[PDB]
Each structure stands twice: as C-alpha cells, then as structure tokens.
C-alpha cells in the first residue's frame, strides 16, 4: 500500500482550485443561526444580520438576552425550542412578549439541539404556507413525529440549500459537544444540502465531505489576525465517525498529507496549519470533521 | 446481536451493590500527578495540588498556573514545564525557572505539548528516583519521545506502577486539542493500562470506562453535584469516540439505564443521561468508552 506521507510546506502557498465540494467557511466574516446555552463571545449582531432565521435552543435564549447586559428588542429570535429546563422565566417571558415562536418539547429522548434542528427543517417546509404550523404539535416529541410524518407523506422538498451557523454547541459539557458532532455527521448523511458550521470561541468546525474538498477564502487575514509569531492559522482533521480509517490527501496545509490514514486510537492531525493563502484542498475517503482556529 | 437494545427509565435514586471488574473512584480528589495545559484555571487548584506528588505544566499551562494567583504564588512551583514553548510567556518562564521548575524544551513538530508532558511524566517515574536531572542533555527536538522508546527497547521500564494523572485545560479549548487529548486517552489505556487519566474541566470530569464491567463509586452524589431541587441527578454521558464500533452497553444505576444498547458515532449516543446511583453505578461495555460526569462543586 502507498506510503503515508506528511510534507512540511512553506508558510505560504497558492493552491489552484481542483466533481468536488466547495467550502467557504468564512463568508460570514438560506442562513440560519442556532443559539445554544453558553455565553456569547462573538460579534453576534454581524452574524445575526446575515441570517434569515434565528433559533434559540432553550437556554440559548438566556445567552442571547444576557448578550445585551444596541437594543435587545431589535434581535428577537424567530423560534425558542426545547424542554425549557434551562431558559429563565424572565427571559422566556421577555421573548414570548416579543413574538418569538415557542415550541416546548418535553421528550427525554431528543436534546434541545436536535429539537431545534427539526424545528429549522420543518420551518423551511411548512412556514411559508402556515406561520403557526408549530402551535398544535404534540408536546413531547411533535417536532420529531411531524418531520417523520412529512417524509412518510412525501411532502418534503429535498431540494433546498441551508447553511446553519451554530453557537455554543462546542466547549461546554463534553457529552453535548460529542452529541453535536454526532448530529453533524448524521445530518450530512441524511441531508447533504444542509451545511453546518459550529462557530465557537476558538474556532469554526465543519465537515469535509467524502471526496475532494476545496476550502477557499479571500485570504487568511480575514480569520487570522496578522501574526509575526504565527504566520499560519491552526487547523485539525478529526476522524470522529464510525467509518475508520480515513485516507487523507491535502494540498495547502503546513503539514500536507498524502495517502495518510487517520483514526481515533491512531494518528490524528492536530496543530496542523493553513499555508494556502486563498484556499486549500483536502481529499478524504469518508466524511471527516475539520476545525480551523479563528482569532 | 439479536438482543433488544433496551433503555430503562429509572427512579431518580437507586442503590447499586458492587459487582473481576474495573473499580473507578473519579471523585476521591474532592501516585497522583497534575498536568496543567493552557487555559484559565477555574477549579480549586490548591486542593488538587496538595493531593499530587508531581505537577507538570505543558508550555502555556505555566501561564495559567501563574495567573491563577493574580495564597503565595511562590508556594506552588511546578516540578516540570515542558513543550516547544511557543505559548509560555518569557516572564512566566523566567519566574518558574528561577524557582526550580525543571525545564524540558522540545521543538518537535510531530508531538504536541500534551504528549511531550505525558512522556515526561512516564519518564519521571522511571528515571527521576535515580537522578534528579535525568532530563538534562536529552535531544532538544524529541528527546523525550526517543528516550521513552529507547528505554523500552532496553527493557529498563518498570511496567508495574499505578499512576493517576489529573489533567486540567485539555478539554474545551481549540477543538483539535480536545480531540487529540481524547485520542491519547484511548491510546494510553491500550498501551499503559495502569495509568488512570482524569480530565477535569470547568464543566465535568472525563475518564475512560474499560472493556468489561466497571463499577463507579463515590461517597454520595452531593460530593460532585451541589444539592439540587430542580436537578435530582448529576448529568453524564457515554461517548464512543474510538475506532472500535459499535460498543454494546449495559448500565445499572443511570437514569436511563441501557441493556445490550449499541452505541457509535453516526448512530445513537447516550448524552444527557443522569446518575441515579446514590453511592455508585455500573457500566459494562464491549470495548473502552469515554464517560463524562458533570461537576458543580
Ligand atoms: C440511552 C439514553 N441516554 C440518555 C438519555 C437522556 N436524554 C437524552 S436527550 C434528553 C433531553 C436532554 O435535555 P437538554 O437538551 O435540556 N440537555 P440537559 O440540559 O437536560 O442536560 C435526555 C434526558 C436517554 N433518553 N437515553
Ligand atoms: C499529519 C500532521 N498534522 C499535524 C502536524 C502538526 N503538529 C503536530 S503536533 C506539533 C506541535 C504542536 O504544538 P503545541 O503543542 O504547542 N500546540 P500549538 O500551540 O503549536 O498549536 C505540530 C506542529 C504534523 N506534524 N503532522
Ligand atoms: Cl494570506
Ligand atoms: Cl446521593
Ligand atoms: Mg433544555
Ligand atoms: Mg433537559
Ligand atoms: Mg430537550
Ligand atoms: Mg506549545
Ligand atoms: Mg506549538
Ligand atoms: Mg509541542
């Protein structure tokens, strides 16, 4: 079998575009903003303005509220969903009194993240026709059932491009972090036209799709404040799925890989860097998570 | 198999009697080693420190330790400070260097500060009792990695020594670092089963459940779960993050107990589970699997 190679490249390279997946993770610097329960440390307003719909997952509402501790009243989430065991009474009242669509789901088998995603998927299927499509659903798992029902009735338009920016889904309770990644892989397998970006305090996390991927951006300066001790943005390729091992070929990373097999309990490329000034290429034998540091 | 994958909703409180099995006592802290990575320290550092024999700072982790005192900072000097040193600040570096910390610089581009620190820890328990300056004059690029390797090829390794390593700031920061840490957790257990690793974060404690039966015990849940009222049970999760999938689970004592429940990424993963066992619980797994338990002391 081919030699697993790692090529140390110069700090800067120009990679020409490659039949392939084109990812533009930094365009933000059908858009949906999903807010989970963690203190918001990014330029919320800037992202918000680029999104068509904003959804708060239970406690995410508190996070949005507290962000204003700008007029808090100018940023009302379209939907607030979950079992509501974290959202605070005052916050809940506040947004309810401002028109946020409340979807309480008491199911102990789906978390607020999943319930919110279902709400988002159902929104792009039923909202344009019925603004209050959510009001009469089952209180336990109506979102789960309804999304399942629509597919059973063939009433689902599988042809709609959605980009979901998720805040506060990574970095908190570890099981929540892993569940989010799990759903990232699952959603791509089930709904390939939905692109998910987890934007955290330290980086942006997305999925590289089986095959050739071309990640582009104007330049690295848009997401990596000019260094001097850091001529390159940090990144990683994380094989967190049940498909192992994954073969990687990269062009444009500081430590470029050629037929390099990656898997947990094996070698994992972390602390890699981006040398491509305008983009880089990653070919993978199966879906794999990639994180790029932002600062 | 063909067995039904069951999930049993248990009452908020249960008493599970002890089960050969792996006994895990994650909260005894509420051969101990403290490994400090680069992130603001939010835990009760001094209490943990006082329970540890050796303390190691992975590069930037020294800054984290330093800033914690912004108690006398001078009373807590780390035994070792290792890594490529591209994050530790000159000031902090000089500060601890002037206080006796053993400095081990490693410029290798193929191992991170975490791994270099672990190697230093493993090497310490092998060579330090012999010579306090065993680390000096080692290769500047990957001497630790080489030494650990050469030491094994020389059969000079004391394979029988129980070590418990408490790691701070390895989870929750840059995601690739989080993943690499978990990767190492699995690798270390495969290669060094006598070393027990506990990742203590701002939100939880993360450790490995070992293939077979595991009995997790503690005085009571009040030890790590500040009395509830609207939260009668501590939160936990079982995360199949290895290359061995799927993993079959059987639990006794969790709010949502599993029986012959198959878990894997791209499939079902038990998250937001809770702990019903008042003094402990049991998890049997077909292969090693990560478990996190939320902490709020
Ligand atoms: C095998 C298994 N493991 C765990 C669970 C628990 N569970 C899965 S998602 C669901 C709700 C999670 O609620 P949230 O999204 O508010 N997260 P939380 O704040 O309750 O920890 C629960 C309790 C379950 N139902 N089944
Ligand atoms: C296939 C592959 N991927 C990535 C790398 C890069 N790499 C692995 S660990 C090593 C050093 C990591 O340094 P640190 O522990 O200080 N973490 P950092 O602050 O540099 O991001 C590097 C640069 C590599 N050498 N090979
Ligand atoms: Cl550039
Ligand atoms: Cl208790
Ligand atoms: Mg909730
Ligand atoms: Mg809940
Ligand atoms: Mg929920
Ligand atoms: Mg370093
Ligand atoms: Mg470094
Ligand atoms: Mg290093």
Residue numbers in the entry:
A (entry chain B): 6 to 23, 30 to 40, 50 to 89, 100 to 325
B (entry chain A): 5 to 23, 30 to 40, 50 to 89, 100 to 326
Can you provide the manuscript's text about this entry?
While we did not get crystals of the TPK/Thiamine/AMP-CPP complex, the TPK incubated with thiamine and AMP-PNP produced usable crystals. However, the structure revealed that instead of a TPK/Thiamine/AMP-PNP complex, we obtained an unexpected TPK/thiamine-PNP complex with a TPNP molecule in the enzyme binding site. This result is consistent with the earlier suggestion that the pyrophosphate group is transferred at once from the ATP molecule to the thiamine moiety. The nitrogen N3 in the TPNP molecule is symmetrically opposed to its equivalent oxygen O3 in the TPP molecule. It is stabilized by a weak electrostatic interaction (3.28 Å) with the S301B γ-oxygen in the C. albicans TPK/TPNP complex. Three magnesium ions are stabilized in the active site. The first two ions superimpose exactly with the ones co-crystallised in the C. albicans TPK structure with thiamine. The third magnesium ion is coordinated by the δ-oxygen from D113 and D115 and one oxygen atom from each phosphate group of the thiamine-PNP. The last coordination of this Mg2+ involves an oxygen atom from the free inorganic phosphate symmetrically positioned with regard to the AMP phosphate shown in the mouse ATP binding site (Mg2+ number 3). The equivalent glutamine (Q206A) adopts the same conformation in the C. albicans TPK/thiamine complex and an opened conformation in the C. albicans TPK/TPNP complex. The structure containing thiamine only exhibits the closed conformation, while both are present in the TPK/TPNP complex.
